[PDB]
Structure formats: structure tokens, C-alpha cells
């Protein structure tokens, strides 16, 4: 699976592309 690694986060995710959905919590450019 495709894992949020984030500092103080640590979600996984059977999609890049919802990994990438959540990851939108955190990033703004990207
Ligand atoms: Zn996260």
C-alpha cells in the first residue's frame, strides 16, 4: 500500500492518487 509518512501523521492508502487526496491536508503547491 502507499503509506502517509508525514511527521506526526502515518495513514495508508490502497491509491497513490487518494495518498496523494490526503497528502492535500498537509501540502498547497503540491
Ligand atoms: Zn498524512
Known amino acids: 500500500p502507499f503509506x ?12 497513490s492518487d487518494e495518498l496523494q487526496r490526503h497528502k ?3 501540502x498547497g503547491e503540491k
Open 24 to 26: 492535500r491536508t498537509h
Open 4 to 15: 502517509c509518512t508525514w511527521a506526526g501523521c502515518g495513514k495508508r492508502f490502497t491509491r
